[PDB]
């Protein structure tokens, strides 16, 4: 699909059997979802942005589907204001910026 | 041009006639630049991100050129780690996400 940027680029993902809405974000190196139970072990990590650092749990090799495109990769879960799909999974689904 | 997302999407911009580097960020509503003195009066504003809020000064009607494409709009200046070009200016240069 070709997404214009007049509105926030929010899409539907499927994660853990669950549907959620998430922002396609080229500024983020990582994927950060709001707090949720995923199956598997996790380890604590900190990540930062404007404002500061938050503590997240890192889960590895998680399957996700973004508009029907599968990606398998690391997902951080923590008190994010919004679910963010970062470059780790955008490259998997073949996303580019074009102008 | 087309930009892959294996690396952070940093490009050169020109603002006041100097080159700087900045991240093309589809997750940002606003454009946020490193501290600089611009002529012009401003309005105070608070912006949020992952870890909390910071304070910035809002200037209106700034011309930037992103990789040769002009855009004119609001810019927020404050102590950001990175210069961020958000959607407010990305739409003006005809930027899309494609997968
Ligand atoms: C710059 C801010 C104004 C902007 N806020 C914003 O647009 N809103 C609050 C409005 C909004 C937008 C969408 C939804 C809701 N509300 C913002 O931080 N928006 C970010 C996404 C987000 C939206 C809403 C709430 C929390 C995060 C973002 O798009 O700018 C981002 F995710 F790309 C920001 C851009 C950034 C990078 C580095 C430092 C500071 C900022 N990245 C991050 O926050 C991410 N951090 C990250 O990628 N880091 C630290 C590595 C990095 C990347 C690039 C360069 C250097 N270092 C985390 C999510 C893991």
Curated annotation (Swiss-Prot), chains A, B:
Homodimer, whose active site consists of two apposed aspartic acid residues. The active site is at 25 (for protease activity). Residues 20-89 form the Peptidase A2 domain. Residues 1-5, 49-55, 88-99 are annotated as: Dimerization of protease. The chain holds residues 501 to 599 of 1447 of the full protein. This is Protease.
């Amino acid at each position: 699909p070709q997404i214009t940027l007049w509105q926030r680029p929010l899409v539907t993902i499927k994660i853990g059997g669950q549907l959620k809405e998430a922002l396609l974000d080229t500024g983020a190196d990582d994927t950060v979802l709001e707090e949720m139970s995923l199956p598997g072990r996790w380890k604590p990590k900190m990540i930062g942005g404007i404002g500061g650092f938050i503590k997240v749990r890192q889960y590895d090799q998680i399957l996700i589907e973004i508009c029907g495109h599968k990606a398998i990769g690391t997902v951080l879960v923590g008190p994010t204001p919004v679910n963010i799909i970062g470059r780790n999974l955008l490259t998997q689904i073949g996303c580019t910026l074009n102008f």
